[PDB]
Amino acid sequence: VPGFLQQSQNSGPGQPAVWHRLEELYTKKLWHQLTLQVLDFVQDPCFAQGDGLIKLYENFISEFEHRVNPLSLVEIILHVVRQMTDPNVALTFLEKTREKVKSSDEAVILCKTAIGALKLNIGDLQVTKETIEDVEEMLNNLPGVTSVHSRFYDLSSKYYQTIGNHASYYKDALRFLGCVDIKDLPVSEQQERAFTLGLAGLLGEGVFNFGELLMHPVLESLRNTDRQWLIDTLYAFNSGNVERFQTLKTAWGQQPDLAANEAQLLRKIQLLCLMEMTFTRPANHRQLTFEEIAKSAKITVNEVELLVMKALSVGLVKGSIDEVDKRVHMTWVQPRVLDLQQIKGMKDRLEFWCTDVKSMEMLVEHQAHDILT
């Protein structure tokens, strides 16, 4: 039976030098070397004819020798893509001989990652909804491993492809930013992930940050490889607002998914120009005109009342507009940084105010010099 494994899996020379180590290693009865070297045997990217032929034999020994369960089996079920190439029998195999089989802190949730991720090409967000939700129902405070957050980000993104809540792409991008442990993010492989990044957090409208994620560089490292004028109008998805070439060109290029966003991305920059003008413009002008609204907002003179009353109903600003002369009135707002690392506003207002109330507090002391007596 070890002679059977030797005659079966050793399909080439030089390879069996460690398979003889395996057929002595079972007599040594030490299986953390299993957990390392046979995991490396699982790891091997090739055509891999031996591993799928021998996974049934390794299950025949996995019935007895209490294996380290999730690691090799889950990394090998996608090495089965030479042997079986069918999830509709692999789901049977999987759910029948693996739901009782785990060795981790929480590995029933990686079992649910397997279920949800193998019900992509056979299922469409109907029965995977409950169980993929049940994954983070069971996460909540647990991931002291967080290597399962790799497959949790996989269910996250590959299930977010199944439409529903575009505002969870800033959060799913936080998951991409907070999934991998070491630095290894590919460039020419994650430029396709830049193509889903930019053109799946851009078109949809649950997002409203408009340059906040553009601060983070792991996306622009993947976007400089993509076509620059799409990335130029991505750079115009910042405080440059009218720019009748830029968003026009991304309405030239990006062909699908420009039907529900028809004028609603214009509505997003139409509500966003108000916060960009009450924060960008160097205030003490808060009750103001309307032509800069009808110029930067790419709206007309007439349609600013819909603009201001809908933008008040949204909830990013709460000032009741002086409507008789189309005069703006504003409140609390959300910032997008000041002078390039906040030099000027910080200095000339914050420290100016510091020495203002500090030195006039010294003046309070100066006239209140001996009123303490």
Partner: protein
Amino acid sequence: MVLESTMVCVDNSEYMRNGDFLPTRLQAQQDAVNIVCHSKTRSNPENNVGLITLANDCEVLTTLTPDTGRILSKLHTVQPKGKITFCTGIRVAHLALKHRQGKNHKMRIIAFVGSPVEDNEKDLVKLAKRLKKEKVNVDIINFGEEEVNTEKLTAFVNTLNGKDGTGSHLVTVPPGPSLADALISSPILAG
């Protein structure tokens, strides 16, 4: 009737769930604890013994006590699956022995190594002359699977004691099947 403060520093690293020891390495180091507690009790019932681990955690786990029942209660649910940390596991032992008030009891520290980790020889020769200042001759009994003939633990024992010292028997593990008694045949009389 020697008065000592034996603080074994157990190993619950991720290499210690296999069966080169009898079924189970828990039972192997457990029997090592059994023989040291029974044997030091037969030399002196008025000692005090505590266990502690170093694989990713070092605790205040056991009070240094003669009662071997508490230690044998704490040899269950140990779960050897951690990442073995060699650096803090001896400083924690000697600061446990500096949290003593009976110091007419002398000092004995033993440690079980069944895992390789690399280290500078400076980072052990300073700790070995530190142990020479710290008045403990450490008797490391190596278990598990291991880098065969580690020089780091060898130089650690060599610069750990000289000039007719206690005679720290660095018993490196025999690689392969053996028992939890043939490896403590030699250090139980002189560690």
